[PDB]
Amino acid sequence: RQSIINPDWNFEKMGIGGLDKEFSDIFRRAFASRVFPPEIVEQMGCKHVKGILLYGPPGCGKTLLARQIGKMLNAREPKVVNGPEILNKYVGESEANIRKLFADAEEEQRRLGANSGLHIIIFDEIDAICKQRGSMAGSTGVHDTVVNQLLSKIDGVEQLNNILVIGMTNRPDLIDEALLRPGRLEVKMEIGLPDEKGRLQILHIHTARMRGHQLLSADVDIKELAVETKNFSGAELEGLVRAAQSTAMNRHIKASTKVEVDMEKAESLQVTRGDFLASLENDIKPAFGTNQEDYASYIMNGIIKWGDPVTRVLDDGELLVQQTKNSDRTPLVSVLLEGPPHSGKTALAAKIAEESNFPFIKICSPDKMIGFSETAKCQAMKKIFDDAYKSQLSCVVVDDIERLLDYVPIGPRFSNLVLQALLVLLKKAPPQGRKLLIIGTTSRKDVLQEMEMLNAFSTTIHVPNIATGEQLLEALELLGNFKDKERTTIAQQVKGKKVWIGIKKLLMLIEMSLQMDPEYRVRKFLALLREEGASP
Amino acid sequence: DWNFEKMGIGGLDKEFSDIFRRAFASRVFPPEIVEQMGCKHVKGILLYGPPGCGKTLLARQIGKMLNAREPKVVNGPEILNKYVGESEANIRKLFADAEEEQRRLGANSGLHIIIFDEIDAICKQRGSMAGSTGVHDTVVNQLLSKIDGVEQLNNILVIGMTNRPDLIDEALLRPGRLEVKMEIGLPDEKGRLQILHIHTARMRGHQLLSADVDIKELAVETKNFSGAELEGLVRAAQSTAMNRHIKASTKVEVDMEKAESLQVTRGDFLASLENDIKPAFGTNQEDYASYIMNGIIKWGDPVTRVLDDGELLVQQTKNSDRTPLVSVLLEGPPHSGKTALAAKIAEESNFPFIKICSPDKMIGFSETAKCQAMKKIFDDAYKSQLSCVVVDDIERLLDYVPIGPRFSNLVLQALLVLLKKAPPQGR
Ligand SMILES: Nc1ncnc2c1ncn2[C@@H]1O[C@H](COP(=O)(O)OP(=O)(O)OP(=O)(O)O)[C@@H](O)[C@H]1O
Ligand SMILES: Nc1ncnc2c1ncn2[C@@H]1O[C@H](COP(=O)(O)OP(=O)(O)OP(=O)(O)O)[C@@H](O)[C@H]1O
Ligand SMILES: Nc1ncnc2c1ncn2[C@@H]1O[C@H](COP(=O)(O)OP(=O)(O)O)[C@@H](O)[C@H]1O
Ligand SMILES: Nc1ncnc2c1ncn2[C@@H]1O[C@H](COP(=O)(O)OP(=O)(O)O)[C@@H](O)[C@H]1O
């Protein structure tokens, strides 16, 4: 008759946010049978469920759940096994340990029967103990014995209906098949990364005890914090809050002359939104996706509009991203950029990518696998593409294809594994209701034409060079160098002919020119420009 | 009674300030504001950086600074046994006292410290290393569960140190377990002055040092010189000086008469610099002697032109932004002298760090070895404000016997991608 739930409980009291569906689901397939009047359940001819598995990315609050589910229940305090703590040197004692503590339920069932209080067991990181049978061909084989002991103990000739087991892990692909099946560990559950609304919920939950004592300036607002915080885990948000508190407090302390803390400014303690922002940009750094630093490294000297082609390219990219965002017949898209060397394809790609405002971005550049072998490169590609599938919309910019695969003209000689890997990957649609964009760059179109790759890409874009005196003058004006008189003579000796050069080249030459004396700089520069004389 | 000058670690002010701010702040501010707050205290610190910056000294002194029980030390993989289920027992024994103190007092417990020298030795990425016995993965799991398990702790602080900050498993470096991670790098001129001041304090106290020696010259003349190496130098020169007085070849003898007055002069320091100490991230005079054999003679105009062009490029790299990387190629017919000249240019660039990579020290190697050596040299070069690296006879480094032709591609790819890699922003 006694209720299995504590008379005083609340879903807001436990303090978990953003996992409402998950909490609702388990209860539905778990506690639904233990609260209803027993009579129908006895007429029901049913056995309560035994076993639940929680698997997902690290530090995602997986454990918090176990703690507050143990606390919620109106039953005995559960038993916990902090990983592989049930190993003994003597022969036959691991099995005795694992069998012990599994028999209080047996005793109470054989005593009362059908009226015993629920028992609860916890097996943190089950993966240490339970592993593939026939694997781990090391010595003493104790693990293969213990797994069989467990299997039998939880389900066998003997029946038990008052025990609930819970296990958390980080590698759900290593557990024994049998264990994870009906009757044994059942209703497999997966904890995923949060959305922005979940981030807001977590931030509000963690920022409730400070607003309740007039400790926070009205300047700070949470919507921004939820916006900038991208690819963040609850632990990361808590750490950010802690760092903000620490830096705010530090202002009142004095060091290098022993420890001093004023008790006057103390009473006027306040935290600043700007302080939060500074801490966010300085110390905390997520480990899932890309960060502003990557873009700041790729697009070094920014972007300048020396002509209409750049605007045209940007417009085309905007149209592509909009289509992929809103289109539904075509869950996949791909665009190939082309241009002669030293045109700046990398920077334009990076910029269009950044402008998408997508959740999951990533940049796979050749200079992150120096000296590797073909297999390592393939596995890296596999992992990078694998991560994207677990989101809703994303864009990956593969750069320098003609390097990922090597096309030394001699021969020719080009690895073959990488090529096929890519040619396949670029036609594998993701799981249902998800969207991806694959932006590639190159500098040798004809070779790609020969390799029958040019028909896999959906479309193409062309990036030209600077090929007009007016454009060169505009670029020089924008940069702000060799101006005034200098500019006066340069325009004099250039407009009466045509030019052909890439922006990078121009930058290095301008630099070199300035490094000479101020009595002959223009001469130097103009002289150099002639040396680089060519045309299509 | 503690002060920052007493410790004697000079030149790491910013790092110490940040560590104090991030790890000893909530324990100093009055516990009333902490009660009204929910600032759960941090429980992880990691240190990494090239050898010779004394990561250990830091730890030793910071441990001393505390006033709540001496620390517990683990020396490398000390906690290991052959009986099953024993290393984990040793691991668990570490936290018993803290657990008991927390249970008995709760919020009125003192601080417990744990130090893990060469953490990498035992802690490593899971799922990769061949744990034939399996102790490594088991220990990793045990630590991960104990540090942050269902039960919560608030009075422990772990400091780890390692020169290889990649083999550490990612699961341990999330904000929950280990938050503050710091790099310790080479020192600057001011740091060198600070260190030299410290190491040579008692000596000044007892008038054992001649005024003939100056400290500013010592600081300037020594560049990219690891601090430890500064201490080493001081000690070596001192030893030389004090030996001068002893006169004994076969039968040991001490000339007390000459020992009445003892002082150290510049000459000892100069000799020690020339002969005794040899920096690693510094520059060495041997290579220049081994490459420019018969010197340089001006037999015609072209040489001056070439030298002038070289220094122009040097200037550009030293005094420009927007172009942190510049590369120049020299070529000519064979047996012409297109090797030494590059070394002369490098010696004239006056950069703190210079290095020459040749096929001479790789003969008989295989491809992977050649790629690894190149990567290592450039990785080491990446750690300084300025640098100058020479590659001699790219041809042989790739192998190109004309028949076929026949050459290795892996090396070519490597060198190619390499030449277009930005230095760590700022150098
Ligand atoms: N409008 C612009 N478009 C492109 N790049 C620009 C522009 N304005 C300035 N830049 C600078 O020019 C350079 C663009 O070329 P980048 O350095 O990315 O090499 P790349 O030519 O793409 O490389 P690769 O040789 O691998 O093809 C970057 O420094 C970028 O900051
Ligand atoms: N003015 C000079 N220019 C060049 N070399 C000089 C000059 N004066 C003397 N030498 C000597 O000439 C030799 C240069 O030989 P070096 O190894 O450069 O020839 P190389 O054929 O370019 O080399 P490698 O076969 O490695 O390419 C050295 O002994 C150097 O000291
Ligand atoms: N929904 C959530 N509500 C509150 N805190 C959360 C939530 N999700 C994650 N966290 C934070 O994550 C941390 C718990 O991580 P945990 O799940 O124990 O890591 P692991 O799964 O590796 O054991 C806590 O500090 C907590 O503040
Ligand atoms: N800032 C410093 N000031 C003075 N001496 C220093 C400083 N940093 C390091 N040292 C010296 O360098 C050496 C470092 O030794 P150790 O700590 O064992 O090195 P590591 O931990 O890097 O192997 C010691 O002689 C130490 O006194």
Numbering used by the authors:
A (entry chain D): 205 to 740
B (entry chain C): 212 to 638
Task: Please give sentences taken from the publication describing this entry.
The membrane-anchored SNARE (soluble N-ethylmaleimide-sensitive factor acceptor protein receptor) proteins provide the energy to drive membrane fusion in various cellular contexts, such as intracellular trafficking and exocytosis. Supercomplexes of NSF, α-SNAP, and either a syntaxin tetramer or one of two binary complexes of syntaxin—SNAP-25 reveal atomic details of SNARE processing and show how sequential ATP hydrolysis drives disassembly. NSF comprises three structured domains connected by flexible linkers—the adapter N-domain followed by the D1 and D2 AAA+ domains.
Following 3D classification, 41% of particles formed a complete complex, all of which have ordered ɑ-SNAP—SNARE spire density and differ largely by spire pose. We observed a nearly symmetric ɑ-SNAP—SNARE subcomplex comprising four ɑ-SNAP molecules coating a four-helix bundle. Even without further processing, this structure was recognizable as a parallel 2:2 syntaxin—SNAP-25 sub-complex formed by two syntaxin H3 SNARE domains and two SNAP-25 SN1 SNARE domains; this binary 2:2 configuration was previously observed in crystal structures of syntaxin-1 H3 and SNAP-25 SN1 domains and was unexpected as we prepared the complex with full-length proteins, implying that two independent SNAP-25 molecules contribute their SN1 SNARE domains to this complex. Presumably, disassembly of the binary 2:1 complex had occurred and was followed by reassembly of the 2:2 binary complex before vitrification. Of the five 22bin20S classes with the 2:2 binary SNARE complex, all are found with syntaxin in the D1 pore, while two are observed with the N-terminus of the SNAP-25 SN1 domain in the pore. Most strikingly, no SNARE substrate-bound classes show an F protomer as fully engaged as those in non-hydrolyzing classes; in all but one class, F is ADP bound, SNARE substrate disengaged, and sits between engaged A and E protomers. Three distinctive “grips” are observed in the case of the classes with the 2:1 syntaxin—SNAP-25 complex identified under non-hydrolyzing conditions (top), and two are observed in the case of the classes with the 2:2 syntaxin—SNAP-25 SNARE complex identified under hydrolyzing conditions (bottom).
